[PDB]
């Protein structure tokens, strides 16, 4: 397979709670803003339920901040070419009903090329997919997933199998 992103299925990362948010997960930047006074738990889980490989990322939300991105997992680097159109695909589910996630892609100036907005995550694995075009001259971009929605408090959201593919 060919993908723009790195370690899209967390298969590179040792199982366990992630405390090193910026660099503990190859291919990813995890970020919790200081406005999040009850911080989440990020965990790489080894599980037979994994859509891809043996591992998933789990995000347990115990509170939120001011903006959905104050709890986020961002794929970086994402290696792309100007003008090219890409397909984004990921799988997600949640421990409980009611979860909300936005799946986005943007440049280092935080301008979004596209997103899936307030996706309704269920207790069953589902694919979430969209297309975007790199409409500027960037070659290295990023893919922020936003979890800091108030509706997610008391839930755990699981993601796996991020694949950004040359359409
Ligand atoms: O520590 C640092 C981090 O702070 C930094 O995080 C990045 C900050 O920038 C973030 O990007 C912003 C995300 O919010 C976007 O605005 C959204 C766009 O979507 C609008 O919703 C639309 C509603 O209609 C739908 O049809 C449509 O699909 C939706 O888009 C929504 O109302 C807006 O609020 C801003 O445009 C972005 O700039 C980025 O995600 C973070 O990763 O990262 C660096 C780190 O050092
Ligand atoms: Ca996986
Ligand atoms: Ca990183």
């Amino acid at each position: 397979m060919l993908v723009a992103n790195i370690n899209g299925g967390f298969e590179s990362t040792p199982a366990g709670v992630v405390t090193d948010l910026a660099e503990g997960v190859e291919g990813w930047d995890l970020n919790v803003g200081s406005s999040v006074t009850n911080p989440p738990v990020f965990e790489v889980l080894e599980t037979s339920d994994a859509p891809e490989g043996n591992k998933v990322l789990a995000v347990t939300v115990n509170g939120v901040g001011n903006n959905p991105f104050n709890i986020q997992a961002t794929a970086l680097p994402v290696n792309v070419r100007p003008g090219v159109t890409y397909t984004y695909t990921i799988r997600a589910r949640a421990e409980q009903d009611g979860a909300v996630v936005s799946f986005t892609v943007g440049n280092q100036s935080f301008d979004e090329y596209g997103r899936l907005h307030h996706q309704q995550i269920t207790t069953e694995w589902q694919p979430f997919t969209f297309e975007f075009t790199v409409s500027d001259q960037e070659t290295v971009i990023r893919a922020p997933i936003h979890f800091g929605y108030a509706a997610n408090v008391g839930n755990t959201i699981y993601i796996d199998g991020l694949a950004i593919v040359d359409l």
Side-chain angles (χ1 to χ4, degrees):
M1 209 173 153
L2 299 179
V3 297
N5 52 301
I6 295 167
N7 189 34
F10 305 101
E11 297 304 306
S12 300
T13 299
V17 172
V18 180
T19 45
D20 184 349
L21 300 190
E23 303 180 293
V25 183
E26 182 172 4
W28 295 82
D29 283 5
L30 328 170
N31 194 312
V32 181
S34 46
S35 293
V36 185
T37 42
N38 323 124
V41 184
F42 291 92
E43 202 175 23
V44 172
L45 289 170
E46 273 182 60
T47 187
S48 284
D49 175 69
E52 180 267 357
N54 298 321
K55 291 164 176 188
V56 308
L57 184 72
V59 185
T60 295
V61 182
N62 307 302
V64 288
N66 297 136
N67 283 294
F69 62 78
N70 296 147
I71 307 171
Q72 61 177 331
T74 298
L76 199 158
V78 182
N79 286 108
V80 299
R81 294 182 301 133
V84 173
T85 300
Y86 297 85
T87 303
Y88 180 115
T89 309
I90 198 170
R91 328 291 181 83
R93 72 187 202 69
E95 197 63 27
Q96 317 281 160
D97 296 336
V100 179
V101 173
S102 309
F103 306 98
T104 82
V105 74
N107 63 18
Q108 282 174 75
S109 279
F110 310 123
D111 250 58
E112 289 185 359
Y113 302 106
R115 68 154 65 196
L116 285 170
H117 189 73
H118 288 47
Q119 300 295 284
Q120 310 289 298
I121 313 305
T122 72
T123 51
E124 290 69 38
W125 285 111
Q126 294 185 105
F128 297 86
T129 187
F130 66 102
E131 299 176 6
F132 66 96
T133 298
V134 179
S135 48
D136 57 13
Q137 292 304 305
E138 297 305 295
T139 57
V140 180
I141 65 168
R142 45 206 298 291
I145 310 170
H146 298 166
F147 302 95
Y149 294 94
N152 292 343
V153 170
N155 211 338
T156 298
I157 302 78
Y158 306 92
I159 59 163
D160 196 22
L162 175 65
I164 297 170
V165 186
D166 199 309
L167 184 97

